[PDB]
Amino acid sequence: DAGYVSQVIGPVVDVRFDGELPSILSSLEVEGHSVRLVLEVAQHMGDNTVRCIAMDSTDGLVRGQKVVDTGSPIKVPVGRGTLGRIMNVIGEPVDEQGPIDAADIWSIHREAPEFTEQSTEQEILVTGIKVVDLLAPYQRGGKIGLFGGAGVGKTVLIMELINNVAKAHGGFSVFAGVGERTREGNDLYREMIESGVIKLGAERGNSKCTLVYGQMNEPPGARARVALTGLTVAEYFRDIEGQDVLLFVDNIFRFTQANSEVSALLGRIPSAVGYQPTLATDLGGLQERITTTTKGSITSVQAVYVPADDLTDPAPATTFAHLDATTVLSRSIAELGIYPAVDPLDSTSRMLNPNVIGAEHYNVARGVQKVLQDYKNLQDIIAILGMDELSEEDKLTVARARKIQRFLSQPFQVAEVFTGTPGKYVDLADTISGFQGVLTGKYDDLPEMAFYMVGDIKEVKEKADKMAKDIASRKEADNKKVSEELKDIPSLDKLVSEIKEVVIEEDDGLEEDFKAEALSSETVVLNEEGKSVPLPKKN
Amino acid sequence: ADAKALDELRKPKFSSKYLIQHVSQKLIPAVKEWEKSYQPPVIHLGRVLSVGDGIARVYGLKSVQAGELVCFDSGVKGMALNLQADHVGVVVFGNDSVIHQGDLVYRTGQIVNVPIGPGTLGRVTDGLGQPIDGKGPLTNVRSSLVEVKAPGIIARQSVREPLFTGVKAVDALVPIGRGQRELIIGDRQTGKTAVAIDAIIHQKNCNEQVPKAQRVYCVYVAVGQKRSTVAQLVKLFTQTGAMRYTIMVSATASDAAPLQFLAPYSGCAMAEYFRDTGKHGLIIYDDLSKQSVAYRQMSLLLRRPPGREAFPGDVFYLHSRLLERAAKLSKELGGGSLTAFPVIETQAGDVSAYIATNVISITDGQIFLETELFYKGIRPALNVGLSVSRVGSAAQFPGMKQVAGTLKLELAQYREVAAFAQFGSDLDAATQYVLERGARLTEMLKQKQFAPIPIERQTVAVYAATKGFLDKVRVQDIVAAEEAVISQVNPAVFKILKANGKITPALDAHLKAELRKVKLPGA
Ligand SMILES: Nc1ncnc2c1ncn2[C@@H]1O[C@H](COP(=O)(O)OP(=O)(O)OP(=O)(O)O)[C@@H](O)[C@H]1O
Ligand SMILES: Nc1ncnc2c1ncn2[C@@H]1O[C@H](COP(=O)(O)OP(=O)(O)O)[C@@H](O)[C@H]1O
């Protein structure tokens, strides 16, 4: 019937069965454990033993603990009952709001959609971000990679992508938090409680987002499989409901990282730099399920953390081929103060094609990339010569590309709470003309800093107005400002009198709520019969 | 060779019995001839097969749990880490020279736990919970596990309260939050312990001023440091009074590798008491790159396969499950917080190391300490283009938020100009002016050691540089000009600015009034 725990090394449990072994990728329950511990069969060890990875911590497991087979892989609730809920890797509600009332629980493991059911149409997903929609335009029904190191703005960009696309999409979205901070998961959950994407109580069914969370405090088995749980929620929303789905995956790098933490304990000799030998095929088996079939559509946005800003690291370098669009975020762009820190050259999309987006959009994007590459080639001789002799053809292409660099920046709606500037949504025909004007030369009379952190081209020519009014200030300094006390302001000692004085306890509250139990000086052991005895004084 | 005839052999097929009835009455008189050489058999107790380098392979111990405290017969404790099929791999909490082959190992019944509570507040502790300061055992304290799972999404709330550190470079540019994990990273002797220590001293200075619930209880975990440094830190914290709110967990270099591995978890479990009982905690994991090294040794001697720089594969999970326990709880869980300050030492400024990149990807903010800024007089050596924080606004002083934006922008103006400091053309007196203000700002941001500043005296001092009031002095005496500013502006400004939090429109008036009323000696 059941099996027993044979070996526990870290997050990898060897379970021995006496006849009728479970299949690979089957789910096993451990009973006698405090919390619900789910093991997924990774391989067959060979002498009627399976080797598993755990979905929770293996602290507490006993060699010989009864492990029961489920006969199926990890099954999770999918459907309309999961909208507005937070799930585990194994489909438990962790939002503390009842059970998940969804019918037809599905396995998280299936094969990829086959070759004949592949869609070939390409329509542009307009996001409102004038560096995304211009240079590397996204595709609805396509896969999007948000590359970039630690601190460059992947989570802020995916928050703005949620706040732009997923609210005005109609269909359902799925967020898969794969190995990230729990604090920003709580931030996303709160910011979708207020914005009405997630609703609570009786109006729960009017929610449009399903959260599946596998964050950093989880063991490496729970981070390796939580992307499959978010993906099978999105696959139910694509295949059965027929809807068009959004699948935001925060740090798909942590999938490969979580598979790397267990692969030495699974008996695999290591590959290149320290990843598993099965890196490309695990990533392919995950990512080929995220497709647009003939039944429905999944538009996936994926953050990819590059380790130490290395794009040649094999875990993002494998990810690069599975994506339709690619938004590489660069640290040196964010060091200029430009946000979002999208590399305007290194970002690529399949939609940048004159047969798809039009020969005006394509040519203005190629012209912006041409003038930015020209400025990047001139940045060498500027720091040795000084940009004074370049004979007004290379001195103009520096100023135009600097206006383009400042014009690629954009204030975000989600970044108001740490910049202050209100966010901007810039439409596609509204950014093509705005970049065509600064490309052809319609805005050389404007100041260079006026392009920084604005929206449309009808905002740079107002920041020029406000800049030339604000430099029209700071002109006179005789008197009549706030510092002369005669206007409306009290003395400095009278403002002190307006302070309410707070209490000070000086006892810190540590003597009234603590259950100060007694701990033994001697150490207490268990003998052969399991009884609690003191340690025997004979070494 | 397969198991089917191997199970058929369980059925008897001997067909003759001319040895069975001969040796069965000959076995027991033979075994009794050697019963003083036999050791008694073992099932639920343990017996040491092999011991060496801090690892005991223990035969028996049938019902041990993974990660369970065991106790050898010589008194030294252990921890059952990898439970293999024929033996248990036990790491030794101490010197393994008192363990022999054939020593009895006793299962204690408990997963590893430390004493938590208010009784630890003021003690110097080892990495396992025993006090090492020579002041007797721990009283008014209770035992709690060191492997508590971090609070989830519904248990947390957004980080809002500041927890100032007293270092005005930090509190102006990289503002901490009260439940935020902030990594102090740099080379050796670049001032990381100084930043953590000044943070603890400033919590001592603020705990005697706030009403009993914004009080911050520091916990310092010294991993891998020598014992003279820990004793000097205890002398510092007692001679300034910071030891009344500070716990110190000290697994030194002489301790075993599992003690240094387990000491950040012991310190986090001691600091989670204040987080779970509504108070606010501050935890400093000094030398987390030494806890990773102790974990590497502990796992390599358990014969687990090595990875990048021979580290374990799960060395990311080691620091992620530790640092994720620093949270800000919801109001139904008390609202208590715990803010982490892990420390990583880099080698020659290589930020692309394995443990360094892992802990950068785990924590919220970063505090980079470069060794070239340290020797240029900039103390603390904050790398302002690389030190990031996730919170930014809504986690700092509202008065400092109005002033430090003009600092964050103008230091960026200074940095993009100073890479053209070989020629000196001084373009239109604008590239000359922005460096002539940015040098003043970097000289403003310097401060001494073991002397933290209250936040009002910081946001007055940056007010005197983001505005005018210091353009008349050279860059060589701004560290004395700001002493003239704080020393001669009337101290009733600081009370109003602390009680308001921001500058009221009656307060920036009086502050611009009194920054010309003072005589600064800059000539
Ligand atoms: N703000 C400061 N002003 C002056 N000196 C400082 C300051 N901060 C640190 N120092 C000096 O720098 C030296 C190194 O300090 P600290 O021990 O904090 O660095 P560390 O990185 O912890 O060193 P280690 O890597 O050896 O642990 C100390 O001798 C200290 O006196
Ligand atoms: N659009 C933006 N505007 C302003 N600041 C930003 C923006 N995007 C990112 N940042 C800064 O970068 C920091 C970290 O960004 P984050 O989204 O956490 O990147 P990652 O997830 O890759 O670490 C934030 O604290 C913020 O200050």
Ligand SMILES: [Mg+2]
């Ligand atoms: Mg992130």
Ligand SMILES: [Mg+2]
């Ligand atoms: Mg140090």
